[PDB]
Amino acid sequence: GDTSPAQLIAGYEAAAGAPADAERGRALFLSTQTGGKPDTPSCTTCHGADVTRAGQTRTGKEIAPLAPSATPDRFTDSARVEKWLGRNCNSVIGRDCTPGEKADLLAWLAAQ
């Protein structure tokens, strides 16, 4: 692609002023939010609670697994991560994810 997961994470960490924490990333990904769209209370509403398995969109189409262990080129395109997190941070949480959240979320997702 044009980047590696580590390089995406390092730049978010620099923008956040702090190392990623995958424990916090796992906890934000599984949480239930009430500030965004009603039909998308969690990251897991489409991607599931196990990211090594396929997810599903809101009309039941299949979404390839987020885990790099199941879909290999995950997180190797900086523009793509920013395009999808920009869209779905807003749907689920109601605002853009901050650089610390992005760092924490990718650090957890990159190890599955």
* Binding positions for heme c: 43, 46-47
Which residues, numbered 20-59, are part of the site for ligand HEM (CB under 6 A)?
29, 40, 43, 45-47, 57-58
How many other CB atoms are found less than 10 A from the CB of residue 31?
13
Residue number, 9 or 66, with CB nearest to ligand HEM: 66
How many other CB atoms are found less than 10 A from the CB of residue 61?
9
Q: How far is the CB of 54 from ligand HEM (least distance, A)?
A: 10
- Crossing angle for the helix pair 5-16 and 99-110, nearest 10 degrees? 150
* Rounded Cα distance, 13 and 103, in Å: 6
Q: Of the candidates 92, 103, 107, 110, which one interacts with ligand HEM according to CB under 6 A?
A: 92
How far, in Å, are 22, 26, 75, 111 from residue 43 at the CA level? 15, 10, 16, 17
Residue number, 12 or 91, with CB nearest to ligand HEM: 91
- Crossing angle for the helix pair 99-110 and 22-30, nearest 10 degrees? 90
Binding-site residues, in ranges, read: 43, 46-47
Per CB under 6 A, does 9 bind ligand HEM?
no
Catalog residues that contact ligand HEM under the rule CB under 6 A.
29, 40, 43, 45-47, 57-58, 63-64, 66, 74-75, 80-81, 84-85, 88-89, 91-92, 105
